[PDB]
Amino acid sequence: FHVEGLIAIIVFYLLILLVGIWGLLVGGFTMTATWVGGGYINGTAEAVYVPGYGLAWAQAPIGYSLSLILGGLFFAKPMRSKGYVTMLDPFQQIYGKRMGGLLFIPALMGEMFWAAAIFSALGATISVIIDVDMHISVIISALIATLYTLVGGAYTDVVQLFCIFVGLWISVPFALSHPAVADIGFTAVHAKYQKPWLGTVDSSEVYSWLDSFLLLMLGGIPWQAYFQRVLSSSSATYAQVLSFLAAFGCLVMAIPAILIGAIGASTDWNQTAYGLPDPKTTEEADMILPIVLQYLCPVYISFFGLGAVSAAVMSSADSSILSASSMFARNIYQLSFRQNASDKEIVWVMRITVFVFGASATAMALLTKTVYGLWYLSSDLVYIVIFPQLLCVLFVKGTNTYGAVAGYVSGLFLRITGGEPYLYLQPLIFYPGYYPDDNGIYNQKFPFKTLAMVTSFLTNICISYLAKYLFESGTLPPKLDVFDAV
Ligand SMILES: *[C@@H]1O[C@H](CO)[C@@H](O[C@@H]2O[C@H](CO)[C@@H](O[C@@H]3O[C@H](CO)[C@@H](O)[C@H](O)[C@@H]3O)[C@H](O)[C@H]2NC(C)=O)[C@H](O)[C@H]1NC(C)=O
């Protein structure tokens, strides 16, 4: 029942690894393999299931699959025109050496959120497999992943995705025919057991929905992996064709997950073995994919499907943790901090970084209780700190290092003053339209995120141009300036 569950996890992890010891569509399918991880498939299964959200509020699968599109036509071509090897390069030359390090901290935080999401998904899967508590399972998974990252001493992304694709598409047909599950064509409009899974956006929340969509479709462009892969390709048309293939792949991958949420929503949980309380009354509603894959499906198929899905995700953490640790070692720390790989220095620092990243990721995975919340917050700080300047480096002329600090502080001021519902923080500026959610944390209905980004943008050029006239004639001697961008 339970102890055989470990064999299911172990037997697949080897195959995904031994085969890792061993025409252009492979590029598209390995670009699709960065975004479709352990959050997509589990968060967009949450968004449909939770009452009061529905499909209309599951804006992330559409958001990222459109960010991959808007990247190719507009950002891919003009980056290659000046030969930037990576996203770090444009910040270094025109904003100086050190500002590049300080402009990558929000990216590190975003990667920390993303890493926490995978730990959260893995914990739930292991918990349903062997009936252990969440509080222990996520810790165990974090320990295993962090240890294997450094004690471990080739197409690994292709294999992991071709296991998820088969695993989900083999169980969903069988669950949909279960006696408990009813017609899915009627519970999308007339609420047989719970509110219809096809969501709604009222006249009040239009601005909030548009603001979230802009945040979540314009905050995926400046990520590191996409711009690393696009820049490497030899042909410019090759890059955009790969981008469109990746968008298509994500859209096709987003179909099995939606059906799982609908199956979970349209079910009579009093007839199956989950008891009278629904997964919503008991605050266990992120487990919707594992729950429907285990209880509704028969014995043999669940043993294949759940094991394959878990083992596919297990190989995602090793890439992300190591990439973020190397990121911290080289871009945030080493720049202008002269050290070499000696006894007490950078490689020891990178060894230590892995432990801190794992501990922070699991600590935040334990505190927050929603995967979709983490996979939403992973695209906020980047959206409001990096993209506003990434626009000005590429197209705007005359941006100086002076302008960067003003926008940096101005956007963060409005963002942290606004407050967050997911992470418990109470607003301080109290934008009009605020209403209480749960008698506790207040929630605002004003596009303060987009307002903050736009304000950062319009101060970046303004103060930067002010400095240029400030350092020429009539107002200020040139000598007394901390930096010299003139
Ligand atoms: C799903 O829920 C239904 C109803 O909530 C459960 O069915 C009911 O189970 C009770 C338990 O013995 C049956 O006994 C009845 O109890 C009431 C209590 O007042 C009594 O007044 C009746 O004379 C009778 O003894 C009841 O007949 C039964 N009702 C139906 C329509 O089946 C059911 O057990 C739950 N679980 C499932 C279906 O897996």
Swiss-Prot record:
Optimum pH is 9.5 for choline uptake. Transport efficiency decreased at more acidic pHs and is abolished at pH 5.5, which should coincide with transporter internalization. Glycans are attached at N270. GO terms for cellular component: axon; dendrite; early endosome membrane; membrane; neuromuscular junction; perikaryon; plasma membrane; presynaptic membrane. InterPro entries: Choline_transporter, Na/Glc_symporter_sf, Na/solute_symporter. Residues 1-4, 43-54, 120-137, 182-206, 265-286, 367-375, 426-450 are extracellular. Residues 76-98, 155-160, 228-243, 308-345, 397-404 are cytoplasmic. Belongs to the sodium:solute symporter (SSF) (TC 2.A.21) family. This is High affinity choline transporter 1.
